[model samples]
Target chain A: SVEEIRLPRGPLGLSIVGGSEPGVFISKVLPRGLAARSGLRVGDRILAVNGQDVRDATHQEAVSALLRPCLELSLLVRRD
Target chain B: SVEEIRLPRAGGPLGLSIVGGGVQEPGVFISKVLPRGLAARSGLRVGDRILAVNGQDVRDATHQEAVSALLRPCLELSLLVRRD
Candidate 1:
């Protein structure tokens, strides 16, 4: 039941936001994550997440929202 | 008359899985979107438009560079949108 959170299907798999700001915090990092493979260091404050306003949410909330069980998605994130 | 692609909602937008550097066609880029979002809200696939943000168009905005420019402030994209 841990993989119940399934995202909507599409062409992309992750949504990552890039930026230059600081203080943003990274909550979670998936195993063999695309971000990780792309050198996205965890605990990094994201300036943006897939062009959305994730700065308003907590690191845990933001990570939770992105980490889905099944269903692949396109992600664009920006770290500070 | 533009913007028709839409994406599946809930959790996140876009569905991409990057492989190695050079592949057959740059990461199996697609446009045949799967879900019908706030736009059609129907079983409309392929014919969908690549709005701007999220999946707002129909062709499932292949690459992030193809439709990432559509996400404006408070736009609330419909899903499956094309690029600018």
Candidate 2:
């Protein structure tokens, strides 16, 4: 089951690459941060946010989705 | 100057790419890793800083140089890496 967790303000505590492409690569994960605790890994590729396809999302668009405020975050990430 | 850290000889590609923070950064940054590739299988992670290859300090090396070192043929390889 996907658990919804509350989030804090500011960055998602991670770095990203492939900004020009819709999908961005997980470049870095902040240690002890929400993203790290959420089972998100370093090599995972973010394919979508909240069921919305972000495969072609610009870096800014994808980041915006992550930065959106909500009670829970639903992310579709690809690993491998 | 650098110290050598030897690793077992493994076939196939490392299955990762160098992305972002090139000439402007202190070390080679790993942008992505193939989930099942040797790199990932070996426990390498994104945001890990590559310090050196084959005892050669890569703190100032370009992406191409670091990549070339990783691609060289050898019975053993040594890579110095730092986790962020």
Candidate 3:
């Protein structure tokens, strides 16, 4: 299942690593952070940011999208 | 779309200046393309977004790192860039 992790503005408290062409995956999530509380885990491949499909975006492109100045972040991630 | 440009190791300068990179800038941009230079003979152009160096994704590279890669001595370079 693709889980949606909603992050309220501040620091995401997570780090990402390269993924199969066009995406990145959670490499680490702070144990006491919102992402950890929201169940974001390492190796979860992010499929989209907000509603934009990032399955084909470059690492920097995905980063730019995640860095959007928004009040919240909705990450669509695939656990499989 | 991503456009790949190849530059053979010819012992010449890339002839391009870049800007808008680093933690604050987020992405690197080509600011200038020198006339009658190596870059001019290739498909590279100003206003292009640098996405990869050789085959490595440099979209998140530091300003100096990105620039250094361009100036780094190697057999050749394979760059993937985008413009919109």
lDDT head-to-head 1 vs 3, winner: 3
Per-model DockQ against the true two-chain complex: 0.02, 0.25, 0.02
Which whole-number lDDT from 0 to 100 does residue B60 have in model 2?
A: 71
Of candidate 1 chain B, the 10-residue stretch with the lowest lDDT total is: B18-27
lDDT top scorer: 3
Clashing pairs in 3: none
lDDT of 3: 0.70
Instruction: Give the per-residue lDDT digits (tens) of candidate 3, residues A11-35.
Output: 7767665433425656557788888
> Candidate 1: global Cα-lDDT?
0.35
Q: lDDT tens string, model 1, A1-80?
A: 00111224322223322212222332234545555454444334443344445556553545555554434533443332
Candidates in descending TM-score order? 2, 3, 1
Predicted model with the maximum DockQ:
2
Chain A alone, TM-score per model: 0.38, 0.77, 0.85
Docking class of 1: incorrect
